[PDB]
Amino acid sequence: DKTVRWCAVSEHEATKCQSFRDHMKSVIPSDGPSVACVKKASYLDCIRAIAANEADAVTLDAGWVYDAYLAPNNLKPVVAEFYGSKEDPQTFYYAVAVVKKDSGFQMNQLRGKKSCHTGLGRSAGWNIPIGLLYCDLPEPRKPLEKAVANFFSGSCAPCADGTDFPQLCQLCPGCGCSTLNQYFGYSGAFKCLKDGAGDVAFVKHSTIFENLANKADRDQYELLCLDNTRKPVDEYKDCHLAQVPSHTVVARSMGGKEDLIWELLNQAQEHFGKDKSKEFQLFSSPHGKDLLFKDSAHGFLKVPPRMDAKMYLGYEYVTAIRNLREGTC
Ligand SMILES: [Fe+3]
């Protein structure tokens, strides 16, 4: 029992958060956990906010979890999302590269094409794909943004600095780091491809199924597999770039209300999880997709006691990120 200050990024998430608050009030008795909403412009401001005791929690893509960990913020993961089904929860998802059918190019011919990324530093939209092309990039490979800017002939990399690297915001001027940028995130990176701005979208396996309901329409897209061949979109299991850890809620290491955060989310999923309520849905919203939590999530799992970002993410993934931020060929 007490108040959890959730950090929403921009207007759409702020709206979902208000609804989340109000509905939780109509079901949770006076002594249960409650929600308060803090609006910030980017996930980055949410991190600082939480570290400065301005807010208490926020869900981040694993790549951004790593950023949350670095000093002086030192946030830790307390609750993770799980996908698939409640019967067989999956704490990972597949990063895929979606292209249009017959666009005429494989993974080893990305140079010169236009790319759509979910956001700078995110697992599927950035780390995995760039990680795999790292040495294909033209030297110098530092700064990384600059090298990526020269490989593609323009792209949309939300959260990148459009001043220092104009080419990274060519498909989405300003590189807005929130849903105010129509090309932000999974569904945004997908729209960037669908509209014809970009040639490839680095998203997750469920994105396309989340945006195109007709097999007819999904049939017009393909996935680039690491063996330089193309496969239909529902064959991602045999055509993906990598498996990455699930998004997770982070909190302060000192006085971070981790117990209250879990009590809230656990009670929230019971009352408003998948197909649980007609008045409100935690994993959906008419105001946007992947607001606060991913729509493709089914519930929450508590993270083991005092586990740090490094352990949570894993040796390999955590290294891939380091290598990306330095690495050699
Ligand atoms: Fe992600």
Swiss-Prot record:
Keyword RNA-binding appears in the UniProt entry: no
Q: Which residues bind Fe(3+) 1?
A: 61, 93, 186, 247
Any single GO BP term:
regulation of protein stability
Gene Ontology molecular function: any one: enzyme binding
Residue positions of the PTM Dimethylated arginine? 21
Residues annotated as glycosylated are: 30
Describe what happens upon changing residue 256 to S: In allele TF*C3; associated with a reduction in total iron binding capacity; risk factor for iron deficiency anemia in menstruating white women
Highest taxon above the source species: Eukaryota
Tissues with expression: Expressed by the liver and secreted in plasma.
The Swiss-Prot or TrEMBL note on domains reads: Has a bilobed structure, each lobe binds a single Fe(3+) ion. Does not always bind 2 Fe(3+) ions.
UniProt similarity note: Belongs to the transferrin family.
Which disease is this protein implicated in?
Atransferrinemia: A rare autosomal recessive disorder characterized by abnormal synthesis of transferrin leading to iron overload and microcytic hypochromic anemia.
Q: What is this protein called?
A: Serotransferrin
Organism this protein belongs to: Homo sapiens
* This protein's encoding gene: TF
Q: Which residues of the full protein are shown?
A: 22 to 350 of 698
